[PDB]
Design a protein around this motif. Sequence first.
Motif, PDB file in Angstrom:
ATOM      1  N   UNK A 295      58.063  -5.421   9.375  1.00  0.00           N
ATOM      2  CA  UNK A 295      57.897  -4.212  10.204  1.00  0.00           C
ATOM      3  C   UNK A 295      58.101  -4.607  11.656  1.00  0.00           C
ATOM      4  N   UNK A 296      58.597  -3.616  12.424  1.00  0.00           N
ATOM      5  CA  UNK A 296      58.445  -3.668  13.859  1.00  0.00           C
ATOM      6  C   UNK A 296      57.040  -3.223  14.260  1.00  0.00           C
ATOM      7  N   UNK A 297      56.616  -3.640  15.449  1.00  0.00           N
ATOM      8  CA  UNK A 297      55.275  -3.405  15.910  1.00  0.00           C
ATOM      9  C   UNK A 297      54.932  -1.921  15.907  1.00  0.00           C
ATOM     10  N   UNK A 298      55.757  -1.143  16.615  1.00  0.00           N
ATOM     11  CA  UNK A 298      55.478   0.292  16.680  1.00  0.00           C
ATOM     12  C   UNK A 298      55.717   1.001  15.361  1.00  0.00           C
ATOM     13  N   UNK A 299      56.640   0.484  14.564  1.00  0.00           N
ATOM     14  CA  UNK A 299      56.798   1.000  13.230  1.00  0.00           C
ATOM     15  C   UNK A 299      55.536   0.825  12.289  1.00  0.00           C
ATOM     16  N   UNK A 300      54.944  -0.348  12.344  1.00  0.00           N
ATOM     17  CA  UNK A 300      53.703  -0.579  11.568  1.00  0.00           C
ATOM     18  C   UNK A 300      52.537   0.270  12.073  1.00  0.00           C
ATOM     19  N   UNK A 301      52.452   0.423  13.381  1.00  0.00           N
ATOM     20  CA  UNK A 301      51.406   1.216  13.984  1.00  0.00           C
ATOM     21  C   UNK A 301      51.465   2.626  13.416  1.00  0.00           C
ATOM     22  N   UNK A 302      52.663   3.194  13.345  1.00  0.00           N
ATOM     23  CA  UNK A 302      52.854   4.543  12.794  1.00  0.00           C
ATOM     24  C   UNK A 302      52.488   4.666  11.336  1.00  0.00           C
ATOM     25  N   UNK A 303      52.836   3.613  10.530  1.00  0.00           N
ATOM     26  CA  UNK A 303      52.519   3.644   9.090  1.00  0.00           C
ATOM     27  C   UNK A 303      50.998   3.492   8.875  1.00  0.00           C
ATOM     28  N   UNK A 304      50.366   2.617   9.705  1.00  0.00           N
ATOM     29  CA  UNK A 304      48.929   2.458   9.552  1.00  0.00           C
ATOM     30  C   UNK A 304      48.143   3.769   9.921  1.00  0.00           C
TER      31      UNK A 304
ATOM     32  N   UNK B  41      43.583  -5.313  22.902  1.00  0.00           N
ATOM     33  CA  UNK B  41      44.296  -5.002  21.685  1.00  0.00           C
ATOM     34  C   UNK B  41      45.138  -3.764  21.830  1.00  0.00           C
ATOM     35  N   UNK B  42      44.842  -2.879  22.784  1.00  0.00           N
ATOM     36  CA  UNK B  42      45.731  -1.712  22.980  1.00  0.00           C
ATOM     37  C   UNK B  42      47.146  -2.127  23.338  1.00  0.00           C
ATOM     38  N   UNK B  43      47.333  -3.314  23.912  1.00  0.00           N
ATOM     39  CA  UNK B  43      48.681  -3.850  24.175  1.00  0.00           C
ATOM     40  C   UNK B  43      49.575  -3.747  22.944  1.00  0.00           C
ATOM     41  N   UNK B  44      48.983  -3.910  21.748  1.00  0.00           N
ATOM     42  CA  UNK B  44      49.799  -3.918  20.543  1.00  0.00           C
ATOM     43  C   UNK B  44      50.338  -2.573  20.188  1.00  0.00           C
ATOM     44  N   UNK B  45      49.789  -1.494  20.753  1.00  0.00           N
ATOM     45  CA  UNK B  45      50.359  -0.186  20.437  1.00  0.00           C
ATOM     46  C   UNK B  45      51.028   0.457  21.711  1.00  0.00           C
ATOM     47  N   UNK B  46      51.066  -0.305  22.804  1.00  0.00           N
ATOM     48  CA  UNK B  46      51.486   0.218  24.124  1.00  0.00           C
ATOM     49  C   UNK B  46      52.936   0.511  24.043  1.00  0.00           C
ATOM     50  N   UNK B  47      53.237   1.667  24.613  1.00  0.00           N
ATOM     51  CA  UNK B  47      54.583   2.150  24.609  1.00  0.00           C
ATOM     52  C   UNK B  47      55.025   2.757  23.335  1.00  0.00           C
ATOM     53  N   UNK B  48      54.223   2.706  22.251  1.00  0.00           N
ATOM     54  CA  UNK B  48      54.659   3.337  21.016  1.00  0.00           C
ATOM     55  C   UNK B  48      54.522   4.859  21.031  1.00  0.00           C
ATOM     56  N   UNK B  49      55.415   5.554  20.357  1.00  0.00           N
ATOM     57  CA  UNK B  49      55.377   7.001  20.311  1.00  0.00           C
ATOM     58  C   UNK B  49      54.396   7.566  19.240  1.00  0.00           C
ATOM     59  N   UNK B  50      53.119   7.617  19.574  1.00  0.00           N
ATOM     60  CA  UNK B  50      52.068   7.816  18.575  1.00  0.00           C
ATOM     61  C   UNK B  50      51.415   9.201  18.587  1.00  0.00           C
TER      62      UNK B  50
END
Length: 129
Positions: free
Chosen positions: A3-12, A120-129
């Motif tokens: 997975x890409x980072x922002x892609x996994x964030x969306x699936x989780x 830890x918010x760095x890991x979702x930063x910039x993602x379209x959530x």
Amino acid sequence: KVFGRCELAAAMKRHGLDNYRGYSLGNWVCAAKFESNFNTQATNRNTDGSTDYGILQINSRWWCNDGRTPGSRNLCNIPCSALLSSDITASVNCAKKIVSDGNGMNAWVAWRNRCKGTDVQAWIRGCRL
């Protein structure tokens, strides 16, 4: 699947992991990053003969059956191979059980040592959530 980072964030998030047991989405993404580098096929053999499987390195000692960890439990009631799939549903369902068992995300050693107390918010930063 890697997975890409922002892609996994969306699936989780879709699978209800975000804020589950009070753990924000960045905590889960950071844990997956350091447990598996986002690779659903990750496996690691432990000294005791158990194996950790999948994006959150869930251990056959307790949580899944692999037929090769004599004396172990299968608390998620699943084959460990289920935890290697491209679809993260089985890994999320089992991770919800683990994080509920009393110790929170300290169940994941890489989270304790590499995510806990960090931004830890760095890991979702910039993602379209």
